[PDB]
Write a protein that binds this DNA or RNA. Structure first.
Ligand code: ADP
Ligand code: MG
Lengths: 754, 788
DNA sequence: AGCTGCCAAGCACCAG
DNA sequence: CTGGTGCATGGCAGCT
């Protein structure tokens, strides 16, 4: 009652689940905090049932809360970034731990996926790149120094963890890292001279190790993510492009929702990492392209088999951590049994990279056979109770089970002997913890129980008895069952000793298999959805013949209107007039997604695409202050290799201010930055730009008025727009006729000056 | 699939399927012994929803029947989970006696828990109404009716068009919505929770009239002012039928219905309710709302009333003057009254349970506690000079007789349920004391028998006990049980003990048990009798709770007016608003820096203000605070200014800026009058430069020329600052800002005339746009300024 | 104080 | 017809 307080002092920053019979119960500010986060009641007490702790842990873990469980003492802790149990994770989403800190120079950043051992490090130069890395990686738990000056970056996030500055010390970090990987220096990983990144990585690794209190043999590498390697996209751009998340917070009507028909959870997670990290290096890209074309035919044969491999990545983490439960080993075995078939289907594929994926996939004949012999066809969830080791694997175990079954058989025949011998049809032998084995007669017959029967328990409508004969065989049964259970466990632990020396090759296999899932999926998508392989050019350019928006074309059952685009150094900017209504916005967004998909190595939705090198993609599409802030970010960071998409800036202030800013932005983008730009606008005055300056041109969307409506066509045409539609839309909407007549008069007089 | 005709089924499932056929779309809890049972798909869904095992009930012919269930004593926890997810549940109980039934015992559905018909304290939120509504659409309009079942408040309206109806659904936010099958305007209603499609015949007018008249004890509905209102009666008739089928008892707290006419209140459109953040902020939460600031009531029933008032400003001048006078009269009495009023609690909802015959012992206890506060309240209120307050004091009643009854009937802190007894107090019923006397000369008797028999046998482990399964016993340990009297009759054997019975203990077992059941039966009969004695006074009781709720509300507005520095507004004959040193009641309490008070002068000669000023300058706030001040004035409340004079307002419209803007605008243009307050916040969107502005201009014209509404017109279009020149009624005001050096300061002060200039370039500059780009845009701007 | 397993009260089922 | 057995979740006896 009183001894909760002292144990809450031991871990004050973490929710304290306190065992109390059938529930775990929280008090003080833990009670308040848990009641609001879990839709359960306050009293200051709260509670959850034992049978569904893991179901409530996972929701608290999902919202950034660590949880200490007190069984007395704190015997378990789960932190949001360091879980690896399947019950606590989402199958198709990464769950990362991260660490951030700040020099007078710049930022250091590390992420770890504790289930795959995927360990990354980076060194963002400034505020904006740092924020872009946080949105992209979206860590479930975020370690930061007490020192941290730029709290604006992390303030709102879940799972913040304030750490002392000495956890970020260079030399401790190097030593910890060199020890984890078994190296003398980090040159082999290309991070030796990246001290900011390393300091973050040393804090992260220390915190991971302290949460597990176990070696982490699956974390054998770290890699550095350099800015120049990827197409940079800021938070706002990422969100607007609706890559994995839609604007409304969901996962549907998203690029992932269309491109992601992978068949294994590890493949779905890898695909989403690729979509969020397009790379500038055409070499990787052409190689992915070639794989996708080469696998076109083999797709229907590959995917059903690949689905049976399952989430080998996360199973392997539990092997590494030595928490892998029997059905984990059963599914690892099930995946090993897919490998030969997969190897046979891939043998033909004329593709150097598919053949490398084929080798790296491996076979593991020995381990397949080991687990075939070692474990039954479908074992229970836990080793705990046995019935998991297969008969014929250990001579000793088969013998103990035989002695148990033979004692148990004698007792069933004892039941039949005592029964027909006494003439009592209700007579039977049962078993429970309180009495072990007993003979049960019903009340009504119990008064004819033989006098040698020692009564031990009266029930409402039966009596139970023991005899020495019954207790003798109980001993045989329980001591046999008991040694067999201890043997099962020791044999199971030994499977871990035999499996674990092949961990490195096994992680290489699950990675290959995950990649194969991604590429085989993208191949099925390209072939299915009528995509085409884009080509790369030396100079900045985008030439698209009949491009579509990859999401909108699947998601609406209206025909989708494909469109050209021609951007070069000689034609760098299009001023897009006409109604928007989603037509311009869709056209600009589909441009960015074709760029993104090209630079992920996927085929693209078009008859043809040629595309030059892109460093960054900016899409300001969707207060005045925020439009202007995002515009400011484009004008400070865009280059002649950037793709810029602006959506009618100037809205939200005066006509002349709005037009002056738009004109000065359009001109800056065209003559100073020279970025490749689609500048959507409502200002007809801006269509005079092509005649004042080189490299700019007018396109537009039009609309046809028929019947009692107006069809907003989505066809992009050359030249400026020569009609507006605000008044036509107001008329349809029921604005009184006399008001529109007056608006039309007013419109003519305002426009006739300009 | 098995052909499961009637004859193929067992008597149990014959009975169950007849019952389920009367509740085909909703879960049925079927009482079978100690369990509520669900079958077939109900079992599978219950299993998913409630987290319970899906099992089977064996069958000799045909298929095995899917089953899930809960023991009867756990039912309330399970109904709560279901009601939270908007599920309805038919509760079916056993009526007959199994011992005198050859076949299955008789079973009826005795209630149906649905999201809008709950009245139990654990299933509701203290400070939020939970309404059942019904909606109906005509060739020409809407019928709508609401019921708060846990108060009896029954309302009827006839919104004339789509937007009024939308605004009504937003204001009332029904937890359950019964609608007619031929409803055409589904956009109003889909994606609403607790949606219940109903057959047309449930909205038939003669049936409605007939049921409502039957319910109220009347021949016609003339005295209620709804005889006139068949569109509304149809919705009300459906509602009343639903209420009666869910509760399956009489509903004597539903003694009245009232029509809500357009003219009796200020109709706020949907955008206005949202944009003023009355009880919900613009991100769905309750923080930083008008209610969060104004609502320091001390009773749940008063909290709800205050929110209903905030949502329905009244236009009756007399009612408003009375509330205003109450607020001034009571200002010194707030610190005294509030701690007492708090102790009354939620008498409203308790009397609902009383009416429903559902009230638990702690309900009658709290009702008794409330009666005990009435004397102290009467005394505090006699001194207060105010006819309205004295009217409430009298309405509040005293109920000395019923207070006395509950003090004699029930113990001080009774248990949660009457099921286990221990509720009725000593001395109230002599037959009950007489029965208690027997099952109580009990543990004194059993200790005596225990010591007597231990000392007589000389067996020192001998104890006396009870066990629900085997009854009373004499226990002796295993090692001493071979020494027990030969008289001792073996009753129950255990591992290390043996339990026995003797005739004297068996007789004492029979007398204690038959008398414990007799005492419980009589308690239950006396407690049901408590209802029969309270119920005849239900009308006055309901009026007392209403008074207490109003008192709570008004006392609160007094305290708020004092603490937050509000003054009494005055009303005038003609449309107009005159504010001196007015403030946004909510923004001024959250801002960490002083609030800049601002004037307003609207009148029939000065009825439209074009408001300019920079982005972040305070235009929206100024417009909102105007509406909030009107709103508070028209609930009787004092108001956040130094002085306010305001004429009659029929309706507040808001448009805060594609087909939706233009449709909303048209609605304002078709339905505004010279008595309407209209807030247009930066409207006018088109596809080209002037397209949208031209519409805003023509719209302003129509508002000034034809409608003559009091209109506040925030705009970024400088071209509209020319409107005063061209049209009577229109004037320019602006929010002051100063540009010193390289930067803008926002003064937040309204001044007459057009702003000096627009400030988009400066705002863009402040947002980080490169200096080089701001230089070039200034150059372009001066080209444009040289045109005119 | 923890863990296991009987029992509630209707009804149908199942062998004899 | 008889005398037995199954059957959800939660209460708590009975054993440790
Ligand atoms: N009278 C006032 N005194 C102090 N601050 C104010 C006042 N009115 C508005 N503000 C502040 O200025 C900010 C912007 O106000 P807003 O009405 O939205 O300006 P606008 O509509 O012109 O863009 C608000 O956050 C509010 O806190
Ligand atoms: Mg505004």
């Amino acid at each position: 009652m009183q001894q909760y307080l002292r144990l809450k002092a031991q871990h004050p920053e973490i929710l304290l689940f306190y065992r109390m019979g059938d529930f775990y119960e929280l008090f003080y500010d833990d009670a308040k905090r848990a009641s609001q986060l879990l839709d359960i009641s306050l009293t200051p007490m709260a509670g959850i049932p034992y049978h569904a702790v893991e179901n409530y842990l996972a929701k608290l873990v999902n919202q950034g809360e660590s949880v200490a469980i007190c069984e007395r003492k704190v015997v378990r802790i789960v932190t949001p970034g360091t879980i690896s149990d399947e019950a606590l994770l989402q199958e198709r989403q990464d769950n990362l731990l991260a660490a951030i800190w700040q020099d007078s120079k710049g930022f250091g950043y590390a992420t770890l996926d504790i289930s795959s051992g995927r360990f990354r490090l980076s060194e963002p130069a400034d505020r904006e790149t740092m924020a872009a890395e946080l949105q992209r990686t979206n860590p479930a738990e975020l370690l930061y120094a007490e020192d941290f000056a730029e709290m604006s970056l992390i303030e709102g996030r879940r799972g913040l963890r304030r750490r002392p500055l000495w956890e970020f010390e260079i030399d401790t970090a190097r030593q910890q890292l060199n020890l984890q990987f078994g190296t003398r220096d980090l040159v082999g990983f290309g991070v030796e001279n990246a001290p900011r990144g390393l300091c973050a990585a040393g804090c992260l690794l220390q915190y991971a190790k302290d949460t597990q209190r176990t070696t982490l043999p699956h974390i054998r590498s770290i890699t550095m993510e350099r800015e120049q390697d990827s197409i940079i996209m800021d938070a706002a751009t990422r969100r607007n492009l609706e890559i994995t998340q839609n604007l409304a917070g969901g996962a549907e009507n998203t690029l992932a929702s269309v491109l992601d028909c992978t068949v294994t959870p590890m493949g779905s997670r890898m695909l989403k990492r690729w979509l969020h990290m397009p790379v500038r290096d055409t070499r990787v890209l052409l190689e992915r392209q070639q794989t996708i074309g080469a696998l076109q035919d083999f797709t229907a044969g590959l995917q059903p088999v690949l689905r049976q491999v399952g989430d080998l990545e996360r199973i392997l983490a539990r092997l590494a951590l030595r928490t892998a439960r029997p059905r984990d080993l059963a599914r690892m075995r099930h995946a090993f049994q897919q490998l030969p078939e997969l190897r046979a289907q891939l043998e033909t594929v004329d593709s150097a990279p598919v053949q490398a994926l084929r080798e790296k996939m491996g076979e593991f004949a020995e381990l397949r056979d080991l687990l075939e012999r070692a474990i039954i066809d479908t074992p229970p969830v836990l080793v705990r109770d046995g019935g998991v080791i297969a008969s014929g694997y250990n001579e000793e175990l088969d013998e103990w089970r035989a002695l148990a079954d033979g004692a148990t058989d004698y007792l069933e025949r004892l039941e039949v002997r005592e029964r027909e011998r006494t003439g009592l049809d209700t007579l039977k032998v049962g078993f429970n913890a309180v009495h072990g084995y007993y003979i049960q007669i019903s009340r009504g017959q119990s008064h004819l129980a033989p006098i040698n029967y020692m009564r031990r328990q009266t029930l409402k409508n039966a009596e139970r008895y023991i005899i020495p004969e019954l207790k003798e065989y109980e001993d045989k049964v329980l001591t046999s069952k008991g040694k067999a259970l201890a043997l099962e466990k020791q044999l199971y632990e030994e499977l871990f000793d035999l499996l674990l020396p092949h961990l490195e090759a096994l992680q290489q296999s699950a990675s290959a298999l995950a990649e194969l899932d991604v590429l085989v999926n993208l191949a099925e998508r390209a072939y299915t959805l009528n995509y085409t392989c884009p080509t790369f050019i030396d100079k900045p350019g985008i030439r698209i013949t009949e491009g579509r928006h990859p999401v909108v074309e699947q998601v609406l059952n209206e025909p989708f209107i494909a469109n050209p685009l021609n951007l070069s150094p000689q034609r760098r900017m299009l001023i897009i007039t006409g109604p928007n209504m989603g037509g311009k916005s869709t056209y600009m967004r589909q441009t960015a997604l074709i760029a993104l998909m090209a630079y992920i190595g996927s085929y693209v939705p078009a008859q043809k695409v040629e595309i030059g090198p892109i460093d960054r993609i900016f899409t300001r599409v969707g207060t005045f202050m925020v439009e202007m802030t995002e515009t400011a970010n484009i004008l400070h960071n865009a280059t002649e290799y950037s793709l810029v998409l602006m959506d009618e800036i100037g809205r939200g202030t005066s006509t002349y201010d709005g037009l002056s800013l738009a004109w000065a932005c359009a001109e800056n983008l065209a003559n100073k930055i020279k970025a490749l730009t689609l500048f959507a606008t409502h200002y007809f005055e801006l269509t005079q730009l092509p005649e004042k300056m080189e490299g700019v041109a007018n396109v537009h969307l039009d609309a046809l008025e028929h019947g009692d409506t107006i069809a907003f066509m989505h066809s992009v045409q050359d030249g400026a727009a020569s009609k507006s539609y605000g008044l036509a839309v107001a008329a349809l909407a029921g604005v009184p006729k006399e008001v529109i007549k007056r608006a039309r008069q007013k419109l003519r007089e305002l426009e006739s000056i300009s």
